[PDB]
Write a protein that binds this ligand. Sequence first.
Ligand SMILES: CCC(=O)SCCNC(=O)CCNC(=O)[C@H](O)C(C)(C)COP(=O)(O)OP(=O)(O)OC[C@H]1O[C@@H](n2cnc3c(N)ncnc32)[C@H](O)[C@@H]1OP(=O)(O)O
Ligand SMILES: Nc1ncnc2c1ncn2[C@@H]1O[C@H](COP(=O)(O)OP(=O)(O)NP(=O)(O)O)[C@@H](O)[C@H]1O
Ligand SMILES: *C(=O)CCCC[C@@H]1SC[C@@H]2NC(=O)N[C@@H]21
Ligand SMILES: [Mg+2]
Lengths: 247, 673, 261
Amino acid sequence: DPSDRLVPELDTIVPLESTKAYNMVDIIHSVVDEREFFEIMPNYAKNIIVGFARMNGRTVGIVGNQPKVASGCLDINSSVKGARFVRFCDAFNIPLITFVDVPGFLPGTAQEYGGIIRHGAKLLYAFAEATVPKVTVITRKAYGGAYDVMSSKHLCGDTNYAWPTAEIAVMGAKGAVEIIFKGHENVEAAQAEYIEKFANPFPAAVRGFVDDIIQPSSTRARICCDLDVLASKKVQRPWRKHANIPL
Amino acid sequence: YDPNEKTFDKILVANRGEIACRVIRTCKKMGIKTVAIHSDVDASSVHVKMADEAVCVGPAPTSKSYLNMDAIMEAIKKTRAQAVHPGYGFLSENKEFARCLAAEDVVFIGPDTHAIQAMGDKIESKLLAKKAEVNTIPGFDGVVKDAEEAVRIAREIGYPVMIKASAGGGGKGMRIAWDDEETRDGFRLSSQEAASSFGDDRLLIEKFIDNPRHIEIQVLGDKHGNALWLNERECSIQRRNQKVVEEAPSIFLDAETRRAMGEQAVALARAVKYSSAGTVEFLVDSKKNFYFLEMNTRLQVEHPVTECITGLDLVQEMIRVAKGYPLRHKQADIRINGWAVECRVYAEDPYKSFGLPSIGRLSQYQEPLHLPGVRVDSGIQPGSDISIYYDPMISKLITYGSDRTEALKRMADALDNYVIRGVTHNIALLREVIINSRFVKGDISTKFLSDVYPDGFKGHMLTKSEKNQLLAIASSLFVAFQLRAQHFQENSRMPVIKPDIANWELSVKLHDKVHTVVASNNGSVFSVEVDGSKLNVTSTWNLASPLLSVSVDGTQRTVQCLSREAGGNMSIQFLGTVYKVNILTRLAAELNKFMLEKVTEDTSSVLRSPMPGVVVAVSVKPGDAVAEGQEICVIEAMKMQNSMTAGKTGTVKSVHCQAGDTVGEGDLLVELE
Amino acid sequence: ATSVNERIENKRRTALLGGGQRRIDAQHKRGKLTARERISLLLDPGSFVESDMFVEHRCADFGMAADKNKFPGDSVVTGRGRINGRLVYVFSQDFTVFGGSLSGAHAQKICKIMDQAITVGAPVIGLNDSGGARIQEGVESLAGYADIFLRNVTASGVIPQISLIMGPCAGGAVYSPALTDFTFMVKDTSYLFITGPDVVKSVTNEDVTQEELGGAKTHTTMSGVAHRAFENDVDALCNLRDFFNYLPLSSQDPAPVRECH
Ligand SMILES: CCC(=O)SCCNC(=O)CCNC(=O)[C@H](O)C(C)(C)COP(=O)(O)OP(=O)(O)OC[C@H]1O[C@@H](n2cnc3c(N)ncnc32)[C@H](O)[C@@H]1OP(=O)(O)O
Ligand SMILES: Nc1ncnc2c1ncn2[C@@H]1O[C@H](COP(=O)(O)OP(=O)(O)NP(=O)(O)O)[C@@H](O)[C@H]1O
Ligand SMILES: *C(=O)CCCC[C@@H]1SC[C@@H]2NC(=O)N[C@@H]21
Ligand SMILES: [Mg+2]
């Protein structure tokens, strides 16, 4: 399997409107070698995807969101499901590959009463403690603190890429408009200018938070070359017996 | 491809699919700017990006996107298009479109309004043909009003007479009767169904022709009074009255009959004053007697196969005729050059009623453009989608050669070397038809598919030698994967001690049989013994390429591994058909006898709501027995709409969820299977 | 004659007086203290050294280029001090200025303080009161949150970290106390949630109030996020000092030993 094989099928897998859902397992099968993917826990917390795959013959770790189930929002179960897998991949020097499509955390009364904060911190810590090379690709959505929790650049990430249909924002356009221009009480145009200047990956790109904006068809080649380059990574940390996982 | 002559500067293509791509190719080769239209769904098609400008026309359904007249009107007005191309189907026949386009300033690439109006109805067409002193099927003159008229006419025309629904068509409305009471009940049924079909209620009585051949005639005309017949075609292999396999040169007819039919078609075209590209259809019996039947006033889908045998560009000539230039060829300038075979690839399942529409998204798509003498006319690319509003058309495969046998062999090779993953196709049926003994000999008719497979299509019946070859190939591939699994990198801490096994003893389960296979590896050559028979399988053994070519006892074969699982299940496409096998070691096969058979009868009746989302709408109607090709309903939840689409045949016993119905997770939606 | 001396006095008085007297009166109306007096109560008197007092935000969008949306300090007070003779680093957040929303300067000051603390080897104490990420900054607030999370994760297991919520903390700022060793709250005045009740009403259509959604009782009785609760702020700070008297300064030192009777 050539490492520079093109994947033109991903150039239109993401719907142009932001209300339609899609399957990330198709993208995972597209990117990995020979379209072989050993999925871990496929019937539990189906809003997150974790499993084992190979890229250029090297075992890699795959973490991603599933917009088909619960719109891809993070919850209590998926947090620990991803966190334990990330920690295990960390322990045995396995690179991690991340696909980000998340609008935030699942809301409601059950998630808050059950302690969503602890498990969100679990996942955030599991990603932040990482030392093995990590590559992250943003497909459509990244809102709120979920973007930071999902292996952003500022958590000692290595390389980050964004598809042309992706965009990074603090929170929803409607909420931002109604909470910023409160006195103006005119959201007819303000929404249009807000979505014209902020509903695109350019504010994050101009600040250097993402390396480049790449076409979806070169994702496999980019990840392969980055993984080949980042094979000799070594990072030092202050000495300690062990750290405090928020379990 | 002379560009010195001045022609139109901008052309509009008001169609979709492969025909739009072919038209864009033809205009690009002539150095003409092209204008394309598209619906909201087809915003990422090959034809919308391959053109230069694009103009949206409306929503997904064809009733509001490609059949919407006003949208095309403003499209032409904005683009200032000097010409318009309808393709085939859709608006290629509607006369009002032609007249309104020709009214203000726009030329219409096609036949004139008068010719379409004349040969748009089945009643006036036969009368004009009879006035044109061409042969026609004997039958009753005028519309039959009651079964009494029908039976008295049947007295002097016999029992093998078919009651035909006047106008309309679409391969429906024709009923077969052979008895007076049968005649009256068939007449009553036709009268009842005419209103349901089209409402004209006019009925046609004509003598049935037994064992007919559908011989196809291509004609080309201009505005100066010149007509050319570009040889013939044969379209006999049909299911649901739709052609699938087409042959450009006719093996049945001789030069004299071909000349006679061409002259008759030219005379009929002159009588109709056709001034564009058109086709004439004939029915030929066993006694070499031909009768006129229908004239298509549009471009035929089968044009490329008759272009291959003559080396002429039909779209180029039709565009030049629309400009006004006369033809540059004579009837003595057309010759038959070789042979050509065309098969139509559909996104349909050939295992149910010779084809059932299917939907999906294509993950892999490759064409055998490197094979000799292969031409592909496809409007699909990897990542494309197959919807429900349009044709399940995928691609047209055309091959040519010096004679019939070479063309058939090349077409079989191309079919074997064709990659489609994601949707089910009818490639197996197409490859099975072309290797039939009767088709090779040349004894085919319109009912060829209705008697060779009385119980329906089942697949390729493989013989003993082919079965042994398939078993050897499967065992070789399994052993190759197992051997590849053992190649690790040097660790320098714990060296790897590879096992030194020599002969692999396997048990292969095919259909409902178990065969013992012994396989040995000697580098890149496999020695396989299947129940005493000895075969050698050698190849490069590339486990990543979609196509793998192997050599079994000198014979060259091409196979594809569609699916592979660690449990031993394997799906391999051999000779077009997909065979499922189960491969295990001898110890595993012996130990598998102690496993209790798992029964999964379940209930599968109540369809609990997958999520608490509200059902915004229900497209389907209560009490539907549709098998596939249609979804059920769409559910809104968390600013998202999710659809519980089912590809499994679920009978609707009763509908419990309607449009705008709030249902929590675990609530029965629709009784299905 | 140079006006570079009266400017210092004006900046100092603006920093000491926060974002206005009306907001301070509103803060006192709800029975809630201010950051500077909190730090004074927590630390030993006469041993607090403040740093990064003149830092201002660099936003130039949505109209904060004017002077009316400019405040020195940027709603955070940082420095170092001593508790019973032992060194400690502390940072406090001011709800008066922009609701305590975190921006580039706020995160920069916290990160510098944490870097100094991990270099020296002294504990970190944080008094959290913030309305969330600064909405008009954009990705800058997200970057600040991510950097603070990274420094919290790095220092885990090396030096003790304590969080003490005194007000309504929402948005992405709730994951920083969760990554610390111990968390404490104040009854009837401290809140902790990711989404507001209005979003709950919009999404799940179920009536809920703020107190039951994120009150001290909810997180201290059957949620397991907070460790202890206190009725007011002075008693909470006294108990925090008493608790800090237990912990060692760093993982490299043995457990503290005190005179016994
Ligand atoms: C990274 C994660 C994200 O993307 S969070 C996106 C923001 N989502 C939100 O819901 C807004 C966050 N704010 C809140 O939830 C509530 O206001 C909470 C935190 C409960 C505050 O409670 P409360 O004491 O009633 O506030 P208040 O009415 O007294 O408002 C006073 C001033 O506070 C400010 N404030 C508040 N939050 C922000 C914020 N995120 N960014 C900037 N400013 C904020 C307000 O501007 C307000 O100022 P003003 O006096 O009305 O002019
Ligand atoms: N007199 C007849 N005798 C025997 N068979 C007939 C007769 N008339 C029609 N048929 C059969 O019915 C079918 C007619 O097909 P066709 O003429 O193409 O209908 P259509 O819908 O008008 N085609 P088109 O409009 O070009 O797509 C053929 O299979 C014929 O074999
Ligand atoms: C719609 O445009 C956005 C309003 C709904 C907010 C949802 S709720 C859960 C996610 N988390 C967040 O901050 N916004 C998202
Ligand atoms: Mg016809």
